[PDB]
Design a protein around this ligand. Structure first.
Ligand SMILES: Cc1ccccc1Oc1cc(-n2c(=O)cc(C(F)(F)F)[nH]c2=O)c(C)cc1C#N
Ligand SMILES: Cc1ccccc1Oc1cc(-n2c(=O)cc(C(F)(F)F)[nH]c2=O)c(C)cc1C#N
Ligand SMILES: *Cc1c(COP(=O)(O)O)cnc(C)c1O
Ligand SMILES: *Cc1c(COP(=O)(O)O)cnc(C)c1O
Ligand SMILES: [Mg+2]
Lengths: 365, 364
């Protein structure tokens, strides 16, 4: 085992620069910056030197295991141009931890988390003018890791490529204010199972979700509510972690989210919201199982305050409605402020854009 | 607007590679001279199909195939018969299964007959890759990937359908029979109810590698995939699972898990059941099998044979299973293996045209 080193970076700047888009007219993940990071690996020689070079097509053997047996994983973290014009990463160390653990589970080769993070900072620094001049826009960082073994054998790869893409993204919604979401709840589809890879950011987990999201849009919903088990546990809202703020069965004010039992992605936003909630010490915080019966029973009892999704995508996305067994079920999130959702959004946004300081942000090299 | 085989644009290779020794082959390591490629866009639909020299694909690094496993594949074989006629084997089932997988993947649909005809043209051009050996074959790998240059999780608006050919030798050195050891850890699950386990989509395989590596660590060749609280035996690696035994009612029985959505509907699986029903010599049961059923039957001397079936290994006998820290012997090779041998003979006789059958088509 070894690692590529940031001190060995070979930088090939681009001679022609692309036009930056209007920060307002940004469609998520459609526009790419001038430069990418690439690092080759072989079982024979280990990691090659890391390269920052102009964005280009990858030349892959059509046998590459990434295209056949989804021998791939990715990450999603953001760079934010603060109110003081200082560019900040947000909990990037957690994204590096999660990516290392995903590589091990994918049988892709391990790397030094610190060396990758430093390589990423160099790339963001070179293309720093892509980090949008807007307090509601950001730069998406897409670390990607693929098996390039030119062999149809189902096996641990002996060649691989780790690359990083940068994409400027506008606010999750046109305005930037809350546009509450409708969820499609069909237990017929399942995102992840116990003993699967649901708790890793591996490409395989997402391919099977598209047909379901298409079926959500057909029934006039924005996202899928992923249900697990005989008693229909609410797990995740699309590609976001699920939070329920309510009066629990014991009459206690509670923030509830499904536990990490292997079918839940340990989101960085999920980690931050739980940390904040524990820290505030104002109500009970419970990593616990939630069913549609628990929710509908609490709704008839006027015990539900707010339900919202959390991820790098939206930060905090309130839920107004769930479509389940052919009826629309209203969640009174927007009727109750949404007081907690608003508070969380303010705190994370204030940190991301350096309106306050915290350990969760690192200023760019 | 589907691509048509009539529109094929053929760019032959000017230099042809050395054909490998049919004996000294590692599976899926050697590739033929030519590949099939067909580009698709939402804006313009299907391009004309291309048969051109094997080359690297030029993909945008944002291609959805590399990020959200927007990909599927197929596996079917071409066999040079004892009469030197090249035959495909139930290829229409492979085209059906691939179409259904594309729909479930939200990849654009195509005319199954036009793809099959395009595949036959490719195999015909490279027909000398189809090995001159009654225990070797040519693997056909239709592959279908989203090339949408966008990180959005969405139905792709660009895609590529390509086909590779790879000559493959007998699964084990001689081609006689070398039984496999299975690693049975219920901690890992290949597929679940409401999943894509009944499709050949790339996502199903990426999550299997860590388990296969853990099998090789404990000196096993394959994973035995266990599902549910009562540890149902589902699949032997990337092969369907068959158990030949005296059942709980004292009846001679061929048993295999049912198609409840966690089982890949294998072509070989369908053929073995068809043959078994036809022979009418013992009971045929698509039924649930547990490790408790197996171990209870083993202590009762009721187990005759266990074997895997797939395009990979037509019939692969199982000798041993590692489960809860102990090695459990299956007496497959002690009992002939009489049934496994018979099935191997019948399918091989058909594949290599020693007898005629509806299951084979002679090459265009
Ligand atoms: C790109 C990505 C992959 C895996 C997990 C998270 C993730 O992050 C995002 C997702 C989405 N996203 C979609 O791309 C698509 C739909 C929908 F399913 F509704 F079509 N929803 C959505 O939130 C968006 C709009 C932004 C980000 C960011 N940053
Ligand atoms: C390539 C493929 C993918 C999915 C389903 C079937 C399939 O076909 C084959 C698989 C394997 N195969 C492996 O590639 C890998 C392991 C192991 F589990 F050991 F890693 N076993 C194996 O049989 C072999 C040796 C031949 C073929 C053929 N033809
Ligand atoms: C990425 C992701 C999330 C959100 O994780 P963050 O690190 O907060 O962006 C939630 N669920 C799934 C399935 C994800 O892939
Ligand atoms: C391909 C495959 C099989 C074998 O199916 P055939 O059509 O007989 O080749 C079995 N199980 C899995 C999981 C497979 O992918
Ligand atoms: Mg037609």
């Amino acid at each position: 085992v070894g690692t590529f080193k940031a001190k060995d970076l070979i930088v090939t700047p681009a001679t022609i620069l692309k036009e930056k888009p209007d920060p307002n007219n940004l469609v998520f993940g459609t526009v790419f910056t001038d430069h990418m990071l690439t690092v080759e690996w072989s079982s024979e020689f280990g990691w090659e030197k890391p390269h920052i070079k102009p964005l280009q097509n990858l030349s892959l053997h059509p046998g590459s295991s990434a295209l056949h047996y989804a021998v791939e994983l990715f990450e999603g973290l953001k760079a934010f141009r603060g109110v003081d014009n200082k560019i900040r990463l947000f909990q990037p160390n957690l994204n590096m931890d999660r990516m290392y653990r995903s590589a091990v589970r994918a049988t892709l080769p391990v790397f030094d988390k610190e060396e990758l993070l430093e390589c990423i900072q160099q790339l963001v620094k070179l293309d720093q003018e892509w980090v949008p001049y807007s307090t509601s826009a950001s730069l998406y960082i897409r670390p990607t890791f693929i098996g390039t073994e030119p062999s149809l054998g189902v096996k641990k790869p002996t060649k691989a490529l780790l690359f990083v893409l940068l994409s400027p993204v506008g606010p999750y919604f046109s305005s930037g204010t809350f546009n509450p979401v409708s969820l499609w709840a069909n237990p017929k589809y399942v995102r992840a199972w116990k003993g699967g890879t649901g708790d890793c950011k591996m490409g395989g987990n997402y391919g099977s979700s598209l047909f379901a999201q298409c079926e959500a849009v057909d029934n006039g919903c924005q996202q899928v509510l992923w249900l697990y088990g005989e008693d229909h546990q609410i797990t995740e809202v699309g590609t976001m972690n699920l939070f329920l703020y309510w009066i629990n069965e014991d009459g206690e004010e509670e923030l509830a989210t499904p536990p990490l039992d292997g079918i839940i992605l340990p989101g960085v936003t999920r980690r931050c919201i739980l940390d904040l909630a524990h820290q505030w010490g104002e109500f009970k915080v419970s990593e616990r199982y939630l069913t549609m019966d628990d929710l509908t029973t609490a709704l008839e009892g006027n015990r539900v305050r707010e339900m919202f999704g959390s991820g790098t995508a939206c930060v905090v996305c309130p839920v107004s409605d769930i479509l389940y067994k052919g009826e629309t079920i209203h969640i009174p999130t927007m009727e109750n402020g949404p007081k907690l959702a608003s508070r969380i959004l303010s705190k994370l946004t204030d940190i991301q854009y350096g309106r306050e300081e915290r350990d969760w942000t690192i200023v760019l090299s």
